[PDB]
Write an enzyme that holds these catalytic residues in place. Structure first.
Site, PDB file in Angstrom:
ATOM      1  N   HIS B 133      46.544  36.980  27.681  1.00 38.95           N
ATOM      2  CA  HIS B 133      47.462  37.942  28.284  1.00 38.95           C
ATOM      3  C   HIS B 133      47.269  37.971  29.789  1.00 38.95           C
ATOM      4  CE1 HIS B 133      49.701  41.970  27.522  1.00 38.95           C
ATOM      5  NE2 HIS B 133      50.125  41.379  28.623  1.00 38.95           N
ATOM      6  N   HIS B 135      48.600  37.652  33.722  1.00 38.17           N
ATOM      7  CA  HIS B 135      49.717  37.851  34.634  1.00 38.17           C
ATOM      8  C   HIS B 135      49.289  37.045  35.851  1.00 38.17           C
ATOM      9  CE1 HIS B 135      52.396  41.187  33.363  1.00 38.17           C
ATOM     10  NE2 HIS B 135      51.376  41.554  32.616  1.00 38.17           N
ATOM     11  N   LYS B 216      57.451  34.848  26.348  1.00 39.77           N
ATOM     12  CA  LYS B 216      57.132  36.265  26.371  1.00 39.77           C
ATOM     13  C   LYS B 216      58.406  37.091  26.300  1.00 39.77           C
ATOM     14  CE  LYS B 216      54.972  40.213  27.214  1.00 39.77           C
ATOM     15  NZ  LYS B 216      54.144  40.352  28.409  1.00 39.77           N
ATOM     16  N   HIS B 218      59.656  40.704  26.891  1.00 39.13           N
ATOM     17  CA  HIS B 218      59.210  41.922  27.544  1.00 39.13           C
ATOM     18  C   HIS B 218      60.361  42.896  27.660  1.00 39.13           C
ATOM     19  CE1 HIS B 218      56.990  44.406  30.457  1.00 39.13           C
ATOM     20  NE2 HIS B 218      55.937  43.686  30.133  1.00 39.13           N
ATOM     21  N   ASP B 220      61.051  44.999  29.966  1.00 41.70           N
ATOM     22  CA  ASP B 220      61.590  45.052  31.329  1.00 41.70           C
ATOM     23  C   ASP B 220      62.726  44.059  31.517  1.00 41.70           C
ATOM     24  OD1 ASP B 220      59.527  46.860  31.596  1.00 41.70           O
ATOM     25  OD2 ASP B 220      58.856  46.093  33.546  1.00 41.70           O
ATOM     26  N   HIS B 245      56.309  42.436  23.716  1.00 37.88           N
ATOM     27  CA  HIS B 245      56.074  43.727  24.327  1.00 37.88           C
ATOM     28  C   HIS B 245      57.411  44.385  23.992  1.00 37.88           C
ATOM     29  CE1 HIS B 245      55.413  46.462  28.093  1.00 37.88           C
ATOM     30  NE2 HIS B 245      56.206  47.037  27.201  1.00 37.88           N
ATOM     31  N   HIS B 271      49.093  44.337  23.250  1.00 37.67           N
ATOM     32  CA  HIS B 271      48.706  45.752  23.290  1.00 37.67           C
ATOM     33  C   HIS B 271      49.324  46.566  22.171  1.00 37.67           C
ATOM     34  CE1 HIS B 271      52.595  45.795  25.250  1.00 37.67           C
ATOM     35  NE2 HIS B 271      52.115  45.132  26.276  1.00 37.67           N
ATOM     36  N   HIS B 319      54.783  49.013  36.157  1.00 37.52           N
ATOM     37  CA  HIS B 319      56.172  48.839  35.709  1.00 37.52           C
ATOM     38  C   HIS B 319      57.296  49.168  36.693  1.00 37.52           C
ATOM     39  CE1 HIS B 319      54.463  47.811  31.902  1.00 37.52           C
ATOM     40  NE2 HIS B 319      53.831  48.969  31.850  1.00 37.52           N
ATOM     41  N   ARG B 335      53.829  57.167  26.250  1.00 32.19           N
ATOM     42  CA  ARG B 335      53.072  55.941  25.998  1.00 32.19           C
ATOM     43  C   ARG B 335      51.568  56.191  25.903  1.00 32.19           C
ATOM     44  NH1 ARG B 335      55.191  50.910  29.660  1.00 32.19           N
ATOM     45  NH2 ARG B 335      52.964  50.405  29.508  1.00 32.19           N
ATOM     46  N   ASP B 359      45.381  41.705  30.289  1.00 30.86           N
ATOM     47  CA  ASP B 359      46.680  42.171  30.798  1.00 30.86           C
ATOM     48  C   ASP B 359      46.368  42.266  32.300  1.00 30.86           C
ATOM     49  OD1 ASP B 359      49.312  43.048  31.091  1.00 30.86           O
ATOM     50  OD2 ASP B 359      49.060  44.933  30.022  1.00 30.86           O
TER      51      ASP B 359
HETATM   52 NI    NI Z   1      53.174  44.483  28.146  1.00 29.01          NI
HETATM   53 NI    NI Z   2      51.208  42.396  30.465  1.00 30.48          NI
END
Ligand code: NI
Ligand code: NI
Ligand code: NI
Ligand code: NI
Ligand code: NI
Ligand code: NI
Lengths: 101, 566, 100, 566, 566, 100
Positions: B133, B135, B216, B218, B220, B245, B271, B319, B335, B359
Site C-alpha cells: 500500500h 503512495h 487501484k 479509489h 476519490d 478503497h 484498510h 483527502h 470514518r 498507506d
Molecule cells: Ni485508501
Molecule cells: Ni492509500
C-alpha cells in the site's frame, strides 16, 4: 525486563558424539608460542610441537568449534583428538596428505 | 567434549528449547529445531573453523555457495529453527548445515574459496517485508522502508501531486513508463498500480499493457459499481490484482452493493477497518468473504490512548477535505470509530485480517509496518493470552501468524510469491538480520538479492566499523549497476510480452506477476478465518457470532521510546 | 545509536529550533521559519515527556504570541504539524492557528 | 445556484476582478480573465468532481492529457488569467477548461483514466526561469537554482578552476564533451558556452562543432576588437549566440571602439551596468543599440544601503585580483559606481534592460535571480508609481514586463524560445507552482518536462506529507532515467548534425538552438526601449535625453528576513 | 626590469633556493629547480598574461593542452621543482614552460582557446595517493579517501559482512562481478583482490579470470604453507600480485616456515610490523628479503603515548575475537608489542619498509594514510636528525623517500605504475593541489583523470565560492558519465582478454595490471634497504646488525588538533 | 573550515548529544540513543582537552548511572566506542559497560 534476553535451559551439550578419539601428549620445543584451532589437521601442525604425528593422522582437536589450545614455549600437555569425518580427505595445511586418509 | 548450554548459546546462539524475548515485548520464541551437528558448527575468524582444508573446501565456484549466513535463528511462517543459510546467484540456495564435506559430516551447504561469510550467531533472520500500500509521494520513502526491513514496495503515484496524495495510482502509459524508469534508481523491488476507476475496459488494458501489476479503485476517482465491475473484468483476463478503497459516502450504494458488484471475484480490500476509507461504518464486514483478501493500514495499529485524537486532522489533509465544509467534516467523522478500531486488533489476532501495510504519507507510516504489527501481537498476548493454536510455553504460533501478515501473505495477494515473501529455496535472497534486543525496530543488516544494501555504519574514518556515530548508510547493493542486478521490477504478463523492458530500456532484473485471480482467503497463511461478523448501524459495535469484539487502548507500547531519539 | 533517516531528519528540526530560541532570547520578533521550528520542537519535547496529543494540541497555541513575531507571520501559519514518539508510539500533533 | 465571491475564492481561487498581493511586496495583480464556466470547475478529492463518468471521461490515453493543473492563476508575459492547464507528452497541451465532454460544457482539456491531477486552486503558476549567466563552479548550483524556480541554466565552466571562477567558458572539445556528459546528471535544461577569445576562426568552429550553443568573450582572456570580430563572424555562420564581458581597462579602446568592432551584429551584453565587468564607466550606454540584448547580473539588484560596501572585496576574489597591487585595486574601484547602480533599476523599469541573470559564484547569487527581479519591481513601484502602460488599478503591466526578464527574453536571446521560456502550447512543460504568500521566494512545486522534480517535503515517515521538518527534496523527475526523459541538453546545429549526442552517448533529450542572429532589441518582450542614454566621464552620472536617471537605496526589502532562517 | 625575491614569491610562488615549511611540521623543502624564464611566467586574471595573442595562442585543440596548472611547486619522488604542468586527454602531457610560442620564449606547453587554467602559484602539487590495503566495508570510504588525497584504492570486500570486516577479499566470480559493477559509481581508481586461501589452483584461476588483480592470503581463512604456495603458483602464471597476512598463531609453522613456503617468489607483506597480523612476534624480519615488498598499516604510525592503550580492543572487534575466550585474548596481546611498534618508524626512515597503507575499518584509518606518513617523517627528523642522503640545509631527500611510500611504490607493487603513481608524462592526470599550510591534511583541489572531482566549496548561493561554510563537495568529475571517463577499473590480463568489461557492461575506462612478478625490494624507490634484522623471541627487541632499533613515543603531533573540528 | 566528511559526521553526534543533555537536565531517564550520544560526546570533548585514552576509558563509565536511564538500557550498551583527535592524532576510546 531485558530487551532480547535469552532464557537458556540448564544443562550441557555433548560434542562430536559417536566418533573415534585418542589422547596424545604434546610438547612445544620451540621458543615461540603456538596456538592450534579446533579443525586443523593435528598431524600437520607446527613442526616445533613434538608428539606422535602418526597417531594424530586424520585427527583434529576434540574441543568446541572455533576454540583453540595454546602452547607456550616448553609447554607440555595432554590433548584429546577426534577423528575427521565427511570424505576424510585432507587438502591443505602443510601439504603432507593432499588426498583421502 | 562437553559444553554448558549457556556457554554454548553465547558462542553459537541459542539451540533447541532455549527461548528468546522479541525486543522489549512480552513475546517469547522457542527454538523448535537445530539443523547442526554439535561440535561441527562453522564459525569465522582468526583460528576459527572456516579456513582452507578445514571448514572451507576445495570446490570450484559452481559447487559452493556465494554467501553463507552462519548459525542463524530463522523466524518464518513455516518454523523457528536454527540453521545455516546458503545463498547462490542472488537466491536462497539451501537451509541446512554449512561446511566442508571433506572433513565434516552432514554438510548440505558447501563453503569454498568463492564463499563470503555473514556471522548470524545470536541473530534472528527473517524474509524482507512486503508493503503493498505505497503512495509514491517521494522517492525518499524507499530508503525509509528499506531501513525498517521492508524490501518490496507495491503501490502507485507520480510524486507529490494531489492525485497521488490521495490515491495509489500511477495514471496512464506516460506516467507508468516514467515511474518504471525511475524505479531502477530505488533499492527495493517495485510493482506499480494503475488507476482502475473507469467504465471503459480498453482504458484499463492500456495501463496493464504499459506495465502495472494491479489496478487501484479509489473513491476519490469514483468507486462506483460500474467502475468496480470494469476493473475486475480486466483483472480476470490479464492476471493482475485489484485493490479497493470503497465508497465511504454510501453514494452509489451500501457495502452490500459493492460486495454484489464484486460478484465473488478476487479482490484485495485496503484498510478493511474503515478509518483509511470505505463504506461507513461497516466496510469491516468484508473479511467474512472467501474472495476478499483483507489488509490493515498502520496508523490504527494497535489501538492506543492517542489514536482517536490524532485521526481527524490526518483524515482531512490526506483527502483534500475542507474542515469548513460541513459535509467534508461529517464524512471524516463517520470514518473514525473507536468501536471498529478496537475490534481490528482482535480480528488480526484471530486471523480474520491477513495483511498489514502502511498507506505511506496518506494516513500511514512507511517505516512502521513491521514495528506496528509486533506491537499488535504484544497487546493481544497481554489482553487475550495464548492462542488456541499455541503448543508449549512460548508464543511461536502467534509469531508465525503475525510475521505472515507482512511477508508471505502480501506476496500471495499480489502474485509475486514465486519470487519473494519467505525464506524458501529458489526465492530471491531478500533477508533481514536482527539483534534480538532490536527485533522489528532497527535491523543489523538488510540484504537485497544477495548483497547487503543498507546497514548501520559507524565512523567511516575509524579503525573499526563500530565507533560512533552509528546510523544507516547505503551499501554496495544500493549502488548503480550492482543495484540493478539485485532488485526486481515486476511487470504484468502483457507488458513483459510487449517488450516494455526493452522499450523503456529498463536496467534492473524483471519479474512477472501471476496467480492473482486464484488466491482466496483460504490461501492466506495462518490468517484464513472467515468470521460471521456484523456491525451495528447505530452503535458501530462489531460482533462475531453475536459475541462483542473489543479491546482496551494501550497507554504505553514496546518498541517505542526506548529506541528512538525523537 | 543506529539512527534511522527519520531520526536524523528530526535533528535538523531540533537545530533549526536552537537558532530561533537564541533569537527570541535576544528580544527579536521571529520570522516564518523560526516560528515554525520553535513551536514544532516544543511539541516533540512534549511527547518525550509523555504528554497526550490532546494536551499538546492546546499547549502549542501558547508558545508564541502575535507580539513576538514579525507582521504577517501568524497568517502564514494556519497550523503546525509534527510527529514524535509518544509512550504509545508515533502520533501526529496538529496545532491550529498556533499564533494569536 | 449562487455563491458569494469570497466563498468562491476560498474554494476555487480568485476570479475576474479579484486582486492578489505578490508575497509581501506592494505589487498587486488583478485576474484579467477566467476561462471556466461557473459551476463546472473541476476539483479533485473525496466526493469531488474528477471521478469516473463525472469530471473524468471514458477516453483512451491518446485522447486525454497526462496531467492537469486545476484552477491555476497563470502569470505570464501574455496575460494574468485563471484557467486549467493540460500537459501531454511532457509538453503544454492546452490552456483552457478541463473536464469530461460527456456531461460538461466547453471542455477543451479532456480528463481520462490516464490523467494525473495537480490542484492549483489558490496558487499562481509560472514558466520556469532561465538563467543565462552560469559559471559551472560546482554541480550543487543546479539544485539551488531549481529550488528557486529556475529550470534552464546556460553558462560555461569545468568546476572550481581559476578560468571558470572568472569566466563562463568551457574551453575546448575535451572539456565541452565532459561537461555535456555530466549535464545528464543535473535536473535542469543545460546549454554550454565555449571560450570565444581567439583570433583564429577554426579554434571557435571546433568548439561549436563539439557542442556549445554560444561563445563567451571575457576580458580575462582578452576582450580585444580582433577577438570580438572573430567570434561574431563564426556566430553569424553557425547560428549561435555571443555573450560579452568587455574591456574594463579600456586597454584596446573605449566603449565606442568595442561597439564599432561588433559592427551592428547581434550580441548579448552581460552585466550591462558595469560592476560585473565592462568598459569603465560607460558600458551601460550599450542599451541604446538595436543589436544589443542587455542583461543585468543580480548582486546590484536592487540598489540598497549595503550594496556599495559589499562590492569591493567581492570584485577582488572573483577576478583573481591583488589588493596590494595598486593597479588591481584602482581598476576594481572604477567598476563600482553608485551612479550607474542607481540608474540600472530605473532602466529595468523602463524596459531598457531586458534580462536579469545571476553570474553564479562570480559576483552573483544563483538562487536569487527571480527574488531580486521582484525586489526591483517593488522598489520601482514604490519610488516611481505606476508605469505609463498600466491600465486599471493594479500592477499587471509591470508584472508582465518583469517576468519576461527571466523567462521569455533569455530564451529568445539564446535561441531556445521554441522549446522553453513561457506557458504556451507545444513548449516543454517546465512549470513552477507558487503559494501567493511565497511568490518568487519558495515554490510549492517545480515541474520539469511534465514530472515534479523538486518540492518541499515533510517527515518521510509521517502519516501525511505536511509534518515538520519541511524542506526541499528531489522527486521522481530528478531520478535516473526519468530525469533524462524530462530534461534537455541544447546543442548547436553543427553538433547535432555531427552526431555528438550519439558519440558521447548522451542520455537526455536533445534540443537545437536556432535564431540567435536574428533577434534584436525590438524582439524583447515588454523590454524594447532604446534610450538616448549618456554617461558623464567625470561624474559618472547617467542621463537619458538629458534628464538625470537615479533612485534611492532601500534600507529594508520584501522577500528577505521574513522568509529565510539565515 | 627587476623585482625583489619576496615580492616575486608572493606573486608567482617560491623559486630556486626558497624554502617552504610543510604544514605545521619541522620538515622544510627547498626548491631545487625552476623551469620558467623570469618575466615570462603565465598568470591568469583581469589584465594578466593568459589572453588572446598574448599568453594564449591561435592553435587548434590538437596543438594545445586542455588544462594547465600554472606556477606549480611539484613535490614528487624525482624532484621538488617549480614548473607549469600541462594535461591533455586526461593524462600528463608535459612538465615545463607554458604559454604562447608566438610571442614567448621556451614554451613547451602551448596554451590555446581550448585550454582551461588552474592557478597553482603558491601551491604544492603532488600525485594522487594509492592505498593498497582497502577493506570494502562501505562505499563511503571512497569519498573519505579521495578527500584526503588518495585517488586509487586497491583491496577487497563485499560490504559490512564478517568476511570483509576481517579480510580484504571479494570471494568468487559472483561477488567479484558485482563489485566491479559497483566500482563505476565510485570516484577513485579501483582494483580488487580475491580470496587466495585455497589449495586448489583452479579455484584461484576462476577469480583471476573473473577480474581480480591480486589474491589476499589471510590467516582468518587459513594462511597455511599449502595455501600460500598455491596462490603464488597461480600469481606466477597470471601476472597478478599476492598480499599476505601470515599465521600469527604460528599454528602451521613459524615465520621461517612461511618464508620457506614463499620460496623467493614476489609477495607483498601487509602490516609487516605485526600489530595488524602476522607471525608473533617476528613477522617484521620479512623486510630483510629481496622478494618481499613490505608495507605498514596506519594505526601504529607514528608511535605515540596513546598507541598501545587503544590497540587491544581494536584488535578484538576487527577479527571477531572473544575477550572472554582466553586463547582469543592471549593471541591478541602477543600481537601488540611496544618494541616492534617503536622500531617500525625507524625502519621507515631507513627505507626498510617501502609502503604505507590504511587497512580501512579493520585496524586502520582510511582518511589518514598521507597524514600519518608525514607525521612519521616529522617525528623521525626530530629524533634522528638529517638522513645520510641529505644534501643542503633542507629535508628534500627525506620528503622524496616518504612521498614514494604512498604513490610510486604501491603502484609498482601492484603492477599499475604504467598508469598512475607519479607525475610523469603519459600517466593518468590524478593530481592533488595543496596550500602549504594544509599540506597532507586538507587538499585545495583533487583532480581525477583531468577533471576536478572534489574540492572545498563555500556557500552555493554566495556571490563568490569562498564564503562559509566551506566543506568538501563532489564536483563534475564525480558525476555520472564524466566520472566513468575519468576513473579506471583495473583488471587482470586474463579478465581483459575474456571480455569481462563487455560482459558486465562496465562503463569506466579499463586498465590492465602487469609486472607484478618481476618487482623486488631493489625496485622500491628510495626504500630498498634490506637490513640484517633480528627479533628477540623473549624480549621482542628489534636489532639490525646487532644495534638496537627503537624510538620514543610522541605526546603531541603536528597535523592534528590545529586542523580538525573533532 | 574545509570540513572533511568525518568532521561533518561528528557534528551529527554532537547534536544528538545536545538533545540528550537537555532531557537529562529535565530529569528524564534517558533511552538507548540518548545515552550513547551523551557518553560519546563526553569522550570527544575529553580528547579535545588532551586527556589520555586510558583516563577516558575510565571516566566514561561515570557519565550516567543505572538510575538515570530507562530499564534495559544498560544491557543494550555493553560498550561505547568513539574516535577523536587527541594531541597525538586520532585514537579510539572503548568504554566497557559504561552504565552501572
Ligand atoms: Ni485508501
Ligand atoms: Ni492509500
Ligand atoms: Ni563578466
Ligand atoms: Ni560571469
Ligand atoms: Ni591483515
Ligand atoms: Ni586488513
Amino acid at each position: 525486563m531485558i530487551p532480547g534476553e535469552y532464557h537458556v535451559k540448564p544443562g550441557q551439550i555433548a560434542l562430536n558424539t559417536g566418533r573415534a578419539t585418542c589422547r596424545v601428549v604434546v610438547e612445544n620445543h620451540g621458543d615461540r608460542p603456538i596456538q592450534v584451532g579446533s579443525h586443523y589437521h593435528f598431524a600437520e601442525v607446527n613442526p616445533a610441537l613434538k608428539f606422535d604425528r602418526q597417531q594424530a593422522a586424520g585427527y583434529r582437536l576434540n574441543i568446541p568449534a572455533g576454540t583453540a589450545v595454546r602452547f607456550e614455549p616448553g609447554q607440555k600437555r595432554e590433548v584429546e583428538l577426534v577423528a575427521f569425518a565427511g570424505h576424510r580427505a585432507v587438502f591443505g595445511f602443510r601439504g603432507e596428505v593432499m588426498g583421502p586418509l | 567434549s562437553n559444553i554448558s548450554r549457556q556457554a554454548y548459546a553465547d558462542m553459537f546462539g541459542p539451540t533447541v528449547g532455549d527461548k528468546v524475548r522479541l525486543a522489549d515485548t512480552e513475546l517469547w520464541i522457542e527454538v523448535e529445531d537445530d539443523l547442526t551437528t554439535y561440535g561441527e558448527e562453522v564459525k569465522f575468524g582468526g583460528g576459527k573453523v572456516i579456513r582452507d582444508g578445514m571448514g572451507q573446501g576445495q570446490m570450484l565456484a559452481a559447487d559452493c555457495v556465494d554467501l553463507v549466513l552462519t548459525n542463524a535463528l530463522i523466524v518464518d511462517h513455516w518454523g523457528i529453527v536454527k540453521a545455516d543459510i546458503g545463498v547462490k546467484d542472488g537466491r536462497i540456495f539451501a537451509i541446512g548445515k554449512a561446511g566442508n564435506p571433506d572433513i565434516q559430516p552432514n554438510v548440505t551447504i558447501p563453503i569454498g574459496a568463492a564463499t563470503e561469510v555473514i556471522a548470524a550467531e545470536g541473530k534472528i533472520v527473517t524474509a524482507g517485508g512486503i508493503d503493498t500500500h505505497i503512495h509514491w509521494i517521494c522517492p525518499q520513502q524507499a530508503e525509509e522502508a528499506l531501513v525498517s526491513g521492508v524490501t518490496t514496495m507495491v503501490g502507485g503515484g507520480t510524486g507529490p501531486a494531489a492525485g497521488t496524495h490521495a490515491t495509489t495510482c500511477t495514471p496512464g502509459p506516460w506516467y507508468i513508463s516514467r515511474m518504471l524508469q525511475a524505479a531502477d534508481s530505488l533499492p527495493v523491488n517495485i510493482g506499480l498500480l494503475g488507476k482502475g476507476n473507469v467504465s471503459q475496459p480498453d482504458a484499463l488494458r492500456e495501463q496493464v499493457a504499459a506495465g502495472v501489476i494491479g489496478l487501484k479503485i479509489h473513491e476519490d476517482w469514483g468507486a462506483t459499481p460500474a467502475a468496480i465491475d470494469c476493473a475486475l473484468t480486466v483483472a480476470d483476463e490479464m492476471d493482475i490484482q485489484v485493490a479497493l478503497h470503497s465508497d465511504t459516502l454510501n453514494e452509489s450504494g451500501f457495502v452490500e452493493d459493492t460486495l454484489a458488484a464484486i460478484g465473488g471475484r478476487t479482490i484485495h480490500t485496503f484498510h478493511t477497518e474503515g478509518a483509511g476509507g470505505g463504506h461507513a461504518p461497516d466496510i469491516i464486514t468484508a473479511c467474512a468473504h472467501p474472495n476478499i483478501l483483507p489488509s490493515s493500514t498502520n496508523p490504527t495499529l494497535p489501538y492506543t490512548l492517542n489514536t482517536i485524537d490524532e485521526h481527524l486532522d490526518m483524515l482531512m489533509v490526506s483527502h483534500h477535505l475542507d474542515p469548513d465544509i460541513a459535509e467534508d467534516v461529517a464524512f471524516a467523522e463517520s470514518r473514525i470509530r473507536r468501536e471498529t478500531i478496537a475490534a481490528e486488533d482482535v480480528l488480526h489476532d484471530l486471523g480474520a485480517f491477513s495483511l498489514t501495510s502502511s498507506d505511506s504519507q496518506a494516513m500511514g507510516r512507511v517505516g512502521e509496518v513491521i514495528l506496528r504489527t509486533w506491537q499488535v501481537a504484544h497487546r493481544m498476548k497481554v489482553q487475550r493470552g495464548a492462542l488456541a493454536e499455541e503448543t508449549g510455553d512460548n508464543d511461536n504460533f502467534r509469531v508465525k501468524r503475525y510475521i505472515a501478515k507482512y511477508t508471505i501473505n502480501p506476496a500471495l495477494t499480489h502474485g509475486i510469491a514465486h519470487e519473494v515473501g519467505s525464506i524458501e529455496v529458489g526465492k530471491l535472497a531478500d533477508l533481514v538480520v536482527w539483534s534480538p534486543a532490536f527485533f522489528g525496530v532497527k535491523p543489523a543488516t538488510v540484504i537485497k538479492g544477495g548483497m547487503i544494501a543498507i546497514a548501520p555504519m559507524g565512523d567511516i574514518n575509524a579503525s573499526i566499523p563500530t565507533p560512533q556515530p552509528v546510523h544507516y548508510r547505503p551499501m554496495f547493493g544500493a549502488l548503480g549497476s550492482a543495484r540493478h542486478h539485485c532488485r526486481l521490477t515486476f511487470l504484468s504478463q502483457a507488458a513483459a510480452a510487449n517488450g516494455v523492458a526493452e522499450r523503456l530500456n529498463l536496467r534492473s532484473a524483471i519479474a512477472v506477476v501471476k496467480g492473482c485471480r486464484t488466491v482466496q482467503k483460504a490461501d492466506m497463511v495462518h490468517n484464513s478465518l472467515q468470521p460471521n461478523i456484523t456491525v451495528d448501524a447505530q452503535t458501530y459495535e462489531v460482533r462475531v457470532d453475536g459475541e462483542l469484539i473489543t479491546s482496551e487502548p494501550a497507554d504505553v507500547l514496546p518498541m517505542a521510546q526506548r529506541y528512538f531519539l525523537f | 545509536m543506529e539512527l534511522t533517516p527519520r531520526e536524523k531528519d528530526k535533528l535538523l528540526l531540533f537545530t533549526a529550533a536552537l537558532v530561533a530560541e537564541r533569537r527570541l532570547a535576544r528580544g527579536l520578533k521571529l520570522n516564518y521559519p523560526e516560528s515554525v521550528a520553535l513551536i514544532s520542537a516544543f511539541i516533540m519535547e512534549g511527547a518525550r515527556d509523555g504528554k497526550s496529543v490532546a494536551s499538546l494540541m492546546e499547549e502549542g497555541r501558547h508558545v508564541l504570541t502575535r507580539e513576538q513575531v514579525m507582521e504577517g507571520v501568524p497568517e502564514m501559519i494556519p497550523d503546525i504539524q509534527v510527529e514524535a514518539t509518544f509512550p504509545d508510539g508515533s502520533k501526529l500533533v496538529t496545532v491550529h492557528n498556533p499564533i494569536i
